[PDB]
Amino acid sequence: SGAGPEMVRGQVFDVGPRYTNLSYIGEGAYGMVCSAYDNVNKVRVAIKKISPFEHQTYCQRTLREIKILLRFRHENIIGINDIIRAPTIEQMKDVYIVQDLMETDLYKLLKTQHLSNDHICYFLYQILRGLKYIHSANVLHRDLKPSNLLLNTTCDLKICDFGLARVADPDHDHTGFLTEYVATRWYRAPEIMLNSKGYTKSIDIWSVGCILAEMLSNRPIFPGKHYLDQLNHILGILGSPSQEDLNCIINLKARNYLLSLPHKNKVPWNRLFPNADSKALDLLDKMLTFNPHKRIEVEQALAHPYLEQYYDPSDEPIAEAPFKFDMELDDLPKEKLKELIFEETARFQPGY
Ligand SMILES: CC[C@H](C)Cc1nnc2cc(-c3ccnc(Nc4ccnn4C)n3)ccn12
C-alpha cells in the first residue's frame, strides 16, 4: 500500500487517510467522480474531485454547487457529507466533495434494462419530487439528464450534479442575464437556443420530459448531432411552431430564423411510443411543450393523472428559506471566487 495519495486514471485523489479504495465512476471537463470507503464512518461514499481554479466559469460552478447543496436537505437530492481541500488557499488546487454512494445512475440502467411502467412512473415521481423542492428554492438545475439521476436497488432516486445550477431571485427580472449554452445538448429546451439569455426554470421541465421519453424507449428522443442540429430534431417531432407560439418569441432574430424553416408536421406521440401508457404520453406532451409559458409546471406535473398513485402534497417538502440574490453574487474574478470557495468549505476544516 503506497504512502502517497491514491490515483485514479492519472488523477491524484488527495483524500487519505479517511477515504480509501478509490474506483472510477465518471468524469467531466474539470472533475472526476470515484467511489471510495469512509474508514471513519465505515460507509461507502462517492467523491467528486473538482479542479476549477484556472477559469472563472468553473469557479462559479464550483461555488454554486457547494452553496446550494450545502443548503439543501431532501430525500431526492444528493447531500454533501464532507468537503476536503488544502489547509491554506495557496495550496488549494482541488476540492473534493464527499457524498453517500449510490449504486448506479439512470443512464447506466437504461443500457441494460427495459423498465416496467411502474418503475418509470415511480422514477418520474421522484425526479419531480426533488425538482419541486429545487424550484421552490428559486434554483434552476439546468442539467437534468439520465446520468444525473442516481439510483439504488430499492429504487430510491437522487438528483446530482449541481455544477450548472444557479439561483434566480424572482424579485429581479433575469431576462438577458442568464448564461447561454446550458444543459446537455439532447436535453435542451428550444428556448435555450431561441432565447439563449432569457429562459426560465421551465427548461428543467423540458429536460424531465426528455428523460421520460428515454425511459419509455431506452433511447434519447432528440439526439441532436451538434448545437444547431438540436432544434431541428425537436421540430422534427413537435412540428413547426404555431403562429401563436411563434409570435411569443421576443427575440426578432430568432423569430425570423423560425419563419425561415420549412414546415414540419407533428409526429403523434403514440406513433413514437406505441406501447406507452396513454397517461404517460399525455404528461410527456405537456412537459415537451414548445411554448415555455404553456409548458406544465412542476406542481401540476406532480398532480397529473399518471402520477396519482404517488402525488401527496403533505409528503413533498419545499424550501423553508428560498434563495435570494445573495446566492447570485459570483460575477467576480476567479481569484476572488477562489476565496469564497475557501470560505464556504472552512466549516469542514479542523479548527475554524
Ligand atoms: C465529474 C462530475 C460528474 C460527471 C457528474 C456528477 N456530479 N456529481 C456526481 C455525483 C455522483 C454520484 C454520487 C453518489 N453515488 C454515485 N454512484 C454512481 C453513479 C454511477 N455509478 N455509480 C456507482 N454517483 C455521480 C456523478 N456526479
Author numbering: 5 to 356
The study reports:
The extracellular signal-regulated protein kinases, ERK1/2, are key components of the MAP kinase signaling pathway controlling cell proliferation, survival, morphology, and migration. By contrast, ERK2 is unusual in that only small conformational changes occur within the active site between the inactive, unphosphorylated (0P) and the active, dual phosphorylated (2P) forms of the kinase. X-ray structures show that dual phosphorylation of ERK2 at T183 and Y185 remodels the activation loop by forming phosphate salt bridges with several Arg residues.
Structures of 2P-ERK2 complexed with inhibitors #8 and #16 were solved and compared to previous structures of 2P-ERK2 complexed with VTX11e and GDC0994. Both inhibitors #8 and #16 formed contacts with active site residues that matched those contacting VTX11e and GDC0994. Unlike VTX11e, the 2-chloropyridine and isopentane substituents on inhibitors #8 and #16 respectively were located more than 6 Å from Y34. Both contacted the backbone of strand β1 at angles that allowed but were unlikely to force Gly loop closure. In contrast, the two nitrogens in the triazole ring of inhibitors #8 and #16 formed separate hydrogen bonds to K52 and W1, respectively. As a result, the Gly loop shifts to a more closed state, allowing the pocket below the Gly loop to accommodate two water molecules that form OH-π interactions with Y34, and favoring outward movement of helicesαC and αL16. In this way, the R-state inhibitors VTX11e, #8, and #16 share small but systematic movements that lead to Gly loop closure and movements of helixαC and αL16 in the direction of the activation loop.
